[PDB]
């Protein structure tokens, strides 16, 4: 019933997906072995959105574990809550994309996409009423970026009316891990522009900034960053998984945040995020959730919202809260900050409220915002790509296995066009 098929591509995608399944099984009371041990009956009527019924009161996720390096799935299986997954959903090659969009899209991605599509076909036909897919991947590598773009495209010709949801970690100028990040990022955006219904631009720089200044976390590993991303992923589907005063599925957020089809790159966030020592001094009400989730430091992208205009924002509230307070806080945000919101769209905020909060907290909010500050996040990638492309740097790799200069040119042109249209609608 409104099922979601989850796909994880690349090492980053698989890590974030494993943490997401950790937090989801925590929400629904599913043990490390996959059997129900929750207390509330509300954890089971919407168990089919992410899980399948196995023999013997056992729940298996609707997850596809995709990568070219078998070590990633070895790690995922060996970790905690890792045996819950279906053994044959794990799909793997032997080589590895080698930080190459070209090999992740043409030469060793293609032989694996057949098996991946077979698995997702089985999962989609098994489910009762599909509503869409979720893909977690990063734009820096070749497996994540390249093969996830290919997979998204294939799903789009096979399921064009279902919603395409992706959670994409984009590269950042400060946190740069591989040398060919601009190429992979540009080539991946060239297909996420027209093949996805909503894209949540994650980045490591903003996550580290959260773990520094907001959480006051001394040594943030990837576990904490993936925990934040998993919290946002759970927030965007809480309304699907639980009842509430206002209910908003993925399609409702998509229709309320995509005025024009190409502007579906959203800046996610979460609230409350508190330090261990500072959470004891903080009042916990709707206004403080509102002020946290609208704060530029809290945002999960390396672009200041104050440098642009909010086309639309979403506030997927959770927990037992008053609707007057929520709507009034959204009203005050819209009024006292009229310069930061687009004038030709009155009521820029989409508000949803669920009643089941995340474990350990009595209320939480997931900020989603379609702002014009994505233009600079894409201009950084565009200028890095242009710098590496005038001198033909590293092009011999991508050209070595089928790609050509015109594909890079068209990817850059598409990214420039999207930046220009964000600038146009910013005014």
């Amino acid at each position: 019933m409104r099922e979601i098929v989850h796909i994880q591509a690349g090492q980053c995608g698989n890590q974030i997906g494993a943490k997401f399944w950790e937090v989801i099984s925590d929400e629904h009371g599913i043990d490390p072995t996959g059997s129900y041990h929750g207390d509330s009956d509300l954890q089971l009527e919407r168990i089919n959105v992410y899980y399948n019924e196995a023999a013997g009161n056992k729940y298996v996720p609707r997850a596809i574990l995709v990568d070219l390096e078998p070590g990633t799935m070895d790690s995922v299986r060996s970790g905690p809550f890792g045996q819950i997954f279906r053994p044959d959903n794990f799909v793997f090659g032997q080589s590895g994309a080698g930080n190459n969009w070209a090999k992740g899209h043409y030469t060793e991605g293609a032989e694996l996409v057949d098996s991946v599509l077979d698995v997702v076909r089985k999962e989609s036909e098994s489910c009762d009423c599909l509503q869409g897919f979720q893909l977690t991947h990063s734009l820096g590598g070749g497996t994540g970026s390249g093969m996830g773009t290919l997979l998204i495209s294939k799903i789009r010709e096979e399921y064009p009316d279902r919603i395409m949801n992706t959670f994409s970690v984009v590269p950042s100028p400060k946190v740069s891990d591989t040398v060919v990040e601009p190429y992979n990022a540009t080539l991946s955006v060239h297909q996420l522009v027209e093949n996805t219904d909503e894209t949540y631009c994650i980045d490591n720089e903003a996550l580290y900034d959260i773990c520094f200044r907001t959480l006051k976390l001394t040594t943030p590993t990837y576990g904490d960053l993936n925990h934040l991303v998993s919290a946002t992923m759970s927030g965007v589907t809480t309304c699907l998984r639980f009842p509430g005063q206002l209910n908003a599925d993925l399609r409702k957020l998509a229709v309320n945040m995509v005025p024009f089809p190409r502007l579906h790159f959203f800046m996610p966030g979460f609230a409350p995020l508190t330090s261990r020592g500072s959470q004891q001094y903080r009042a916990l009400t709707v206004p403080e959730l509102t002020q946290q989730m609208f704060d530029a430091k809290n945002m999960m992208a390396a672009c200041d919202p104050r440098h642009g205009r909010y086309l639309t924002v979403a506030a997927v509230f959770r927990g037992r809260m008053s609707m007057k307070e929520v709507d009034e806080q959204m009203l005050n945000v819209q009024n006292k900050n009229s310069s930061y919101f687009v004038e030709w769209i009155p009521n820029n905020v989409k508000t949803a409220v669920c009643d089941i909060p995340p474990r350990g907290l009595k209320m939480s909010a997931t900020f989603i915002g379609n702002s014009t500050a994505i233009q600079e996040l894409f201009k950084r990638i565009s200028e890095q790509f242009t710098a590496m492309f005038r001198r033909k740097a590293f092009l011999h790799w991508y050209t070595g296995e089928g790609m050509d200069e015109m594909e890079f040119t068209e990817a850059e042109s598409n990214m420039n066009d999207l930046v220009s249209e964000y600038q146009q609608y910013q005014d």
Partner: protein, 430 residues
């Protein structure tokens, strides 16, 4: 006889219906499981032996909102045939609720309404509950009212709405749906009552001194208003108002069928002790701007017809005195072509109090329904929001992406322009 069928579509309609049915079960003595440990025939039909099933229907395009009802306290009041769930939500799309999702659920609700209407012998009409901002409550309500008008016809169709507020709004595409639904609500609704969430919140803040009111208090007030409307059918009094005479008194012109509801006295428990809740003072409180259930100032509008539905310990002479005092107030204005503009009904049954509710027990209560021109500026500001979002063609690709056309939006906008012109030319003096 004198049965009425309540249709609850959309999340708002279903929740308001939950409130209404809790209120009615409290009023008539029906337990939540359907046993009474007469006058309930208006809304409840006795089935078999000691079982009353309400003449309701709960339709939504998502399962969950119906699902807490199917597993809640009133799971045995209903049976799963008037609780209807779809597969996918309309997603704040009038187009999805009207064309793509509505088409495969309209037949089932239609024949459920058929089996619920052929059972009763004195059907006065229908009560449809929804919002204008929601995709379901706009599109599927439009489709359902099309079907009801083409099937039943002369039968009355009372409509309850949650109008979008000037400022308190939760959907970005809300003006689009609100403009689209009225293009059929105009010619398919005999009477359309408006309720605005911002006004109800402000009322709860001042009168009911609740700092943090949720949707449940809003639905409690709406259910109280609906109960006050239907008490004439469900009980007896000195002056009784049927739905037909209600429409005859309240609707001057076929396009002008959008009255404003209000309730009095809406007070807390501690405020009730120190208040002299006389007929005159609640009659006055009905007309003052701050207790209007829709955010609009009646001062710069002019009234056409007011339906005063008194209930409780009320005698007609003080009602006439209160109306006489109202007629002498310069601040309240009436159109010249309506020398008398008060249809009055008095009912003996006092308004009951839901356990755990914020409303205090009162001897008397008034639900005044005024058809006024004060809704014209609300519609004008809705049109301003609509053409602001429409000058840039924003969000239109979602609606036209399923089978709607641009001509639908253009014709809805010109229909609202004509309707605003109609109020302007009917409020003018002669």
């Amino acid at each position: 006889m004198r049965e009425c069928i309540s249709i609850h579509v959309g999340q708002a309609g279903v929740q308001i219906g939950n409130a209404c049915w809790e209120l009615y079960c409290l009023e008539h003595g029906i337990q939540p499981d359907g046993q009474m440990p007469d006058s309930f025939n208006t809304f409840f039909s006795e089935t078999g032996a000691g079982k009353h099933v309400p003449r309701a229907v709960f339709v939504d395009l998502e399962p969950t909102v119906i699902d807490e009802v199917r597993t809640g306290t009133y799971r045995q009041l209903f049976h799963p045939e008037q609780l209807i769930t779809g597969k996918e939500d309309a997603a704040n799309n009038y187009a999805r609720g009207h064309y793509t999702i509505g088409k495969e659920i309209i037949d089932l609700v239609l024949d459920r309404i058929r089996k619920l209407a052929d059972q009763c012998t004195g059907l006065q009409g229908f009560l449809v509950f929804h919002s204008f901002g929601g995709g379901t409550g706009s599109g599927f309500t439009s489709l359902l009212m099309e079907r009801l008008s083409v099937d039943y016809g002369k039968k009355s169709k009372l409509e309850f709405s949650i109008y979008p507020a000037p400022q308190v709004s939760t959907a970005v595409v809300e003006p689009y749906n609100s403009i689209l639904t009225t293009h059929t609500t105009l010619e398919h609704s005999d009477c359309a009552f408006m309720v605005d969430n911002e006004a109800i919140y402000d009322i709860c803040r001042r009168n009911l001194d609740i700092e943090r009111p949720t949707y449940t208090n809003l639905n409690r007030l709406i259910s109280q208003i609906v109960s006050s409307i239907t008490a004439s059918l469900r009980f007896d009094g000195a002056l009784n108002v049927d739905l037909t005479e209600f429409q005859t008194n309240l609707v001057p012109y076929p396009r002008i069928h959008f009255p404003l509801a209000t309730y009095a006295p809406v007070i807390s428990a501690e405020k009730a002790y120190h208040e002299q809740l006389s007929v005159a003072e609640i009659t006055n409180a009905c007309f003052e701007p701050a207790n209007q259930m829709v955010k609009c100032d009646p001062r710069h509008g002019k009234y056409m017809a007011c339906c005063l539905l008194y209930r409780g310990d009320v005698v007609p002479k003080d009602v006439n005195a209160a109306i006489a005092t109202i007629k002498t107030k310069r601040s309240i204005q009436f159109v010249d072509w309506c020398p008398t503009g008060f249809k009055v009904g008095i009912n003996y049954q006092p308004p009951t109090v839901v356990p755990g509710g914020d409303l205090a027990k009162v001897q008397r209560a008034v639900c005044m329904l005024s058809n006024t021109t004060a809704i014209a500026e609300a519609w004008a500001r809705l049109d301003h929001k609509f053409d602001l979002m429409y000058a840039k063609r924003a969000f239109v690709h979602w609606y036209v992406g399923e089978g709607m056309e641009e001509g639908e939006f253009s014709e809805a906008r010109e229909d609202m322009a004509a309707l605003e012109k109609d109020y302007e030319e009917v409020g003018v003096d002669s």
